[PDB]
Amino acid sequence: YEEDYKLALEAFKKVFNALTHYGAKQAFRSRARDLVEEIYNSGFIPTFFYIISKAELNSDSLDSLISLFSSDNAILRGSDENVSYSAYLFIILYYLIKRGIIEQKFLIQALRCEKTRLDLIDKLYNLAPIISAKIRTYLLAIKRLSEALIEAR
Amino acid sequence: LYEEDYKLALEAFKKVFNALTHYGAKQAFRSRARDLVEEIYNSGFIPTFFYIISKAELNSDSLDSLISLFSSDNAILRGSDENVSYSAYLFIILYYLIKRGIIEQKFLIQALRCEKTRLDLIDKLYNLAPIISAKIRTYLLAIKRLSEALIEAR
Amino acid sequence: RIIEIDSAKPYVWVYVTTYELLKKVKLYLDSISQLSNASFSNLKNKIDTILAKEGKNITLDSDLKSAILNEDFYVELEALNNKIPSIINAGVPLLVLEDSIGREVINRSLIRVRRIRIDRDKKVVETGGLWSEEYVPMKTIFFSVLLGKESKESAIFASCILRNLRYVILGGKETIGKGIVELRWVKDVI
Amino acid sequence: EELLMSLKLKALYPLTGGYNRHSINPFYEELVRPTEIKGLWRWWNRVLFNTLAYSTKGKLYTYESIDRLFEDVFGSENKKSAVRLEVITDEGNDNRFELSYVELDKVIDCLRNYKRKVSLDFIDNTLIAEIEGSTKIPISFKSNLDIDKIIKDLVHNNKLLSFELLGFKSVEIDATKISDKKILKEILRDLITNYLEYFNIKQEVTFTLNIYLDKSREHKQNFEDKLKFALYSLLVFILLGGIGRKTSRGFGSLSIIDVKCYDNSICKKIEDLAKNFLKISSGNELKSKIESILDCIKNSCIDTLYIENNILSEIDPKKNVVYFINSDLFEVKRINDKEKVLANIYKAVSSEGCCIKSIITDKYVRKSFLIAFGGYRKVEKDKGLDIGFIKNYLCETCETVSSFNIVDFLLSEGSFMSDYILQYEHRNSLLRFKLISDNSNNSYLIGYILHSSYFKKIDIKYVRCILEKLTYCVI
Amino acid sequence: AIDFLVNILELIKEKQCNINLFSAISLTSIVYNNFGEFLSNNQSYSTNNPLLKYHIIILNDKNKTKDVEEKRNIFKREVAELISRNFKLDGEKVRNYFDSLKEVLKSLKYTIVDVEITTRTRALIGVSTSLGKLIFGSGISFDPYMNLPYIPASEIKGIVRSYIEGKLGEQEAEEIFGNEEREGNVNFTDAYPTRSKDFLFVPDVITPHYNGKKSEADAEPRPVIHLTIAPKVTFRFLIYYKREDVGKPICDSMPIILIRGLGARSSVGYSLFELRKIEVIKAA
Amino acid sequence: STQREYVFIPITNSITIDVKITIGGSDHITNIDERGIHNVLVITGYAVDEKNGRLVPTLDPCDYVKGILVAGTPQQAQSNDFLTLKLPANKLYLIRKKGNISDDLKIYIPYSSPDARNSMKTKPVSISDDTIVNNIIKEVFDKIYNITQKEKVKIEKVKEDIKELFSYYALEQ
Amino acid sequence: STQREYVFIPITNSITIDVKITIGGSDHITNIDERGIHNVLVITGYAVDEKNGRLVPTLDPCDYVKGILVAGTPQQAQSNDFLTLKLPANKLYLIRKKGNISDDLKIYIPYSSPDARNSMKTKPVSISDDTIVNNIIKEVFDKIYNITQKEKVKIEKVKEDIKELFSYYALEQ
Amino acid sequence: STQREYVFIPITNSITIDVKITIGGSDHITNIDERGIHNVLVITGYAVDEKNGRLVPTLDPCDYVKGILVAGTPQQAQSNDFLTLKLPANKLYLIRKKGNISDDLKIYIPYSSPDARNSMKTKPVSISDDTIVNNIIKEVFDKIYNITQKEKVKIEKVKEDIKELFSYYALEQ
Amino acid sequence: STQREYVFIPITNSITIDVKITIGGSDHITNIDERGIHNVLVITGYAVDEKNGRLVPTLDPCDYVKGILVAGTPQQAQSNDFLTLKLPANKLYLIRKKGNISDDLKIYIPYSSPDARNSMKTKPVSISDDTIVNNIIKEVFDKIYNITQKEKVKIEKVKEDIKELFSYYALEQ
């Protein structure tokens, strides 16, 4: 029994539907193949900083990302690289809401207000040693799904 | 009571982010955070640091708010956006120097306050150079990631 | 890069080493003397002569007393009458610094060049097309050993191939002219 | 990518400045700066575009929006300029200011232990070094530039030149404390270099302005018409403006010598329209040619085709100030002497000049007039003459005896335009003068008044024949 | 130490090709950025340091901070002039370097194409690179171990490649310079100044008035003193390869692309070059 | 001054009779110029009241409602059931922002009583069912924006802009 | 011996009847097989004479003209107006090579005197208005390479490289 | 109006009888003004034919010949070999551009037929062996540029460059 | 609009006279490019009824027919036995795609009545017996593709693809 593969299935379902343009999907595939090895070597917090820096957390994309947590009709817009980093960010946050590491209400109230994403990063920094051990198999499954389903250039 | 580079950068960026009232100051600080790290590498820490101090134009009242920033979360950096940004980045660097116990807060506030202590600061920085250039660029890389993450591109 | 007052011979740049790197070279030489019939006792003697001074910054072939290295690090040096001239032929001085000061000096002694990609329609920089590359300066010296097990081919390799192997291309960025390297062969340099 | 056109131009008494604010320096000589040509081309283009937009729509757009609309030809932070300027000043080989020697060690003597201001003066054909401590030592020196004995007089007579010469003339040397002789020597040496370089003024600088065009930048939406409008703006710049310093007072005035198209389909309506200036028999002919070109772009030429794009931005009336050409104000008179004309421009534009004194009285409107048409001036509230009176002659409310009322200039209620008119130091002058020549030895004084956006529907009739009177008195 | 800093200007004036210009400018930037402090009886009381004359000049006796500001502007101009005058070219080490590298490449059986190009106007290469960046806000691409300004191999390759694109198509451009799947066939070295008629650097200025400005109310000159590469400076670089049927495009591309700019702000005719010489040495 | 009223966009059309002042003023908050909707407001902590859909006060930060903001006053048949308020044009969550607002705005919002009678249990509902998007773009998008089919001809996008951007939580009770 | 004729490829075609050989030998130089056109030659310092186009010797290195090589001597009413050369198959400016030649090949190019009675002011020209592409498909890429549409259905790739592989300088006067 | 002659500079003494005019007009394009040569003209795709040295057209951009532009007409013994052409003064690759132009010039370059009876494989040639430099001063810089011996005592100023600039290619056949 | 005709490839010859428009237009989706048959359409839920062979509609997704998609219009005697379809070029299930289509098409496919009296029992059938492909090449790819039999004797190259790819299902009744 490996339920992180089912969690990866449902998260990959959501993000594979939320990426309209195929270039966005291929970009997410490259993100998935890179960031798991990056979080292995470098740790969770540096990789998370890198991810949120390349994700362009404007309230627009933040709102599409919040709506992904409920809708399955939400869409991620932006450049292919931007949306791929946002999709990987949603992957991580989805794993965190599931597995109860972070309350969903706190996550949503942080993604809404800009004065609270800092508290979100603080909580994630406090929990990073746990997250680093937990999410490895989930992210490896995400990577396998990406390179299985999304074609490459 | 030891904060790793990323935790330290988070807590510094928090005060810097709440202290920049007008959004254009934040957007300029973003470009400061994105270029000054490679500047610090290429030209050295000490030259870049006094370059930042000069670009801030501490103005004797920008300096007083910059100092109140260390004490209370109620402070505010006022001035031109392209100067307030440099003053906020100067605060970033001073916060690092202080919390890492490399240089004392009283001495740094003095060396920023008036003229004689500034050259003593130059001396002290040349004495403390290997302690500073050891790991400050990781702290500034964290600052740069945070500013790229939390401030919209212009 | 060096700035120094009070020296008749002026220098734009100087060689820098640490005692760590010298101890690693010594370790390599000791290990290969234990695993082969080879003894590089000239190198070992020069290296341990330098290593005897471990704990303070020294200058081998110069009269440098003070200097600023890479415009950040003020060092006070002191002479040493060994002067390995076959590895530093050009009479360029060789500084050997402590390990706590030499790490920062050496690490800021590399060349970080920014490159870009031009959007060939607007002829401006493509979005995201900006990155930096570290290079090792020209005239940098590395130390390595080539070990060979016994074979009739190892003889031909060490007597015919390695004797005509002088220049190679290492690393990447070759079309930017960034890989050419000379191999010295301590065997016939020391 | 390909040469578009080539313009042999000619500037008279250019006051081009480099890093030292002079046309020459210890390292090179540069009489024409391509960056200045590009900047003035863009400035004239924005003036011409607001002129057009106001003669059809009565709307005025910010400079930001205008250059954002033209960024396909002139480039911006997001796109490389499609036009490449290449100045070729003939004789433009290596020349620089060399002070072979200066015989001080006598000025240094009379300087020590004191705090004195060392003034210079170069008339008398020998450099003297006045000292406010009451001594005037004549200085012997040898330089590389030969001040032609006409330039000394051109600077000593022109009250504007000799005014902007105050900044390149003196140092207040303090030798009370420790003061060796050597560093005083270098101080006075650089002061002398800074003073002598100012006299590098040549008459008739002649250069060739090539214009190259990147074809790769396609006809994206409206490239061809934007480019044609820009070429018209360049012609209007060559006709109405000059290069370098104080072009608003006749210096650096440009004149066409030869135009050659190389892509007919884009510029063959500028080639001939500039050929229209190689021979100017009388002043009336020139004024007619200028009104011809001005009207051509106004209604007859291209159209509102790209003004319909929704990237422009109408100006705020009280927070913005833009300029545009007014076709009515284009006096032309024959010159017969250029140096004296340039010297009389001061009679035209000075509050105590004996031409505007003889054209305007009451002095208040006079100040007012110049303050509204002579760029910035240093008026200060000390002796009443500013109090109310000039504030009155600028009220947009409050009377009509003055034909010019600044938009938001309020009685004691100054919010923005009051400070801008009375305090903002860098304000160009609307009243401008230019000098033209052709391949013949005919020379004409244009005097025009650019229309601004802070005038609340100025009385175009009063100031119009003020301008003919000014143009007469100064020629 | 601090005496290094107070003497850096003297050292610039007295060495003139033998100090590290990179670190020298970096150090004098500390003086420039603490100017008002280096002028409060902290000039070491020397007699050759140019900091002396800024105690002798009285620019504004009323307000001292304005006086220090004007003295600082004058000192910026003086630093630019100092570097342009004293730091000159000694391109014998460069000719040695290129000759030795040519022998190395011959031993590796390359076809070498050595190109000498002379600047025609004041050139700006690497305007965003760090050199004088902390004084002038503008830089020059500077090799701090050759102690010379240089033109990166990547810029030369990029300009040649964009011209070869614009002429022979992207497909031929990739057949020559490669793509993400094949490596290029043509190698470029950096270009270094081998000879000059006079100064190697010269000062210049750019003074935007209406750059990102709403209206004339926003107009104000903001002058920017900076260093440029003087005209008549010859640069040299190499082009080496193995496949012979790649020398034809290179041959053709070089004379043209240098007429058009090669560094920054060529749109206003700054970084223009002439082709001085091209020699080709076929590996025989 | 300048008054604006909130237009919820649910899959329940309480919209054929909801507004009299379509535009009224010389501007709007929401805009549509061939890039889809713009300046869309989001309201959190509230949910719709689908039976004559109006915003009931919940307290779940996950319960959000997305609607358009247009100038005007409600029907002159209210003011005993809505929550008017004023905020300085930066204190409102606006999506797809395209311009800036007038620094001071009065906002009318359809509002329902807390109705402390039964546990409000909400569900996340989307906007599917092309018939529903069609009668949505019919009721409100036509009368409020007669720009429809007169200047906006690529109405294909604006309907996908409500099929993807718009969504909300519903009481379902 | 070996002999080829260089045919210009402008957007103005007297390209129809000026030479003779269509097959001539067992092999050609310029090939269009499965990957586009091959061995396209380029001549620098020349410009076409589009009205009955021939290569006109300028001497500016910028001006260039591309064309393709097909065996044949031109209509043999000639040896007075066309340029005859003899190059060792390596001084040729072949673009998109696949295989080289016997190291001696004779070239015929449409030549004319530089006409020292007019200012030869040239202008750069590309190949667009794909109707032109179709007629040149019909006029050389059908006359010479009638292998097309009987062997090669790669017409898309030989359309998209004409607009890519051939651009020249003309006189326009 | 204005006409010039292109005098290429080989090692050969085969460039003596090339002249018909000494000055003719009032100007020479090339200058020798106290710093050496100026306005040197390059023609690419051409190799010299030192066998009675003239220029021969090739099809290689690596082949090129440098020289000067003297004012005049060729010999009166022509109309069969040289090639005259009119160019707008910007279609010339001028090495060491010193001054400006007049925007339309007629030029004569010494042309020779390609002689397609031998493979025209050419090789580079640099002008060394300064005795030929010191006698080419006599030949071309003392028959036309008699400023040499008149004002300019620095004729080694041009030795340094004739030994370093005026290179070319040659058939060597 | 471009309109394509689809045709099954069975082992039995019932496709001789069913195509009339060989090309008519200007392109064929199905190709033969140096690798065999290209850009082939496979259709689900239909078998073949070799006795007057046409695609009978079943509901088994396990059944399928791989077919050629050529330029054509069926026999001009149609509209009662041929399913007409207009599909935006992405619903087409194409395999071995090389080039893309311009995003619309009309496809005519050979239908047959379901014959709701005999339980349809579908069998998997694969093309073998090179005789059968020996005549399928000429009845199809020599009638439709005027290309091959002019370019390659690599027709066993497409024979191996016919035997390889075009499997299908039959009704056995």
Automatic annotation (TrEMBL), chain B:
Keywords: Antiviral defense, Cytoplasm. Belongs to the CRISPR system Cmr5 family. It comes from Saccharolobus islandicus (strain REY15A) (Sulfolobus islandicus). GO terms for biological process: defense response to virus. Its main location: cytoplasm. It comes from the Archaea. This is CRISPR type III-B/RAMP module-associated protein Cmr5. SUPFAM superfamilies: AF1862-like. It is found in: Cytoplasm. One of its GO terms (cellular component) is cytoplasm. InterPro entries: AF1862-like_dom_sf (IPR023101), CRISPR-assoc_prot_Cmr5 (IPR010160).
From TrEMBL, chain C:
Keywords: Antiviral defense. It comes from the Archaea. One of its GO terms (biological process) is defense response to virus. Residues 1-182 form the CRISPR type III-associated protein domain. This is CRISPR-associated RAMP protein, Cmr4 family. It comes from Saccharolobus islandicus (strain REY15A) (Sulfolobus islandicus). The chain holds residues 97 to 286 of 286 of the full protein.
From TrEMBL, chain E:
The keyword Ion transport does not apply. Keywords: Antiviral defense. Pfam families: RAMPs (PF03787). One of its GO terms (biological process) is defense response to virus. Residues 132-274 form the CRISPR type III-associated protein domain. InterPro entries: CRISPR-assoc_prot_TM1791, RAMP_III_fam. This is CRISPR-associated RAMP protein, Cmr6 family.
Automatic annotation (TrEMBL), chains F, G, H, I:
It holds the Pfam family Cmr7A. GO terms for biological process: CRISPR-cas system; defense response to virus. InterPro entries: Cmr7A, CRISPR_Cmr7_comp. This is CRISPR-associated protein Cmrx. It comes from Saccharolobus islandicus (strain REY15A) (Sulfolobus islandicus).
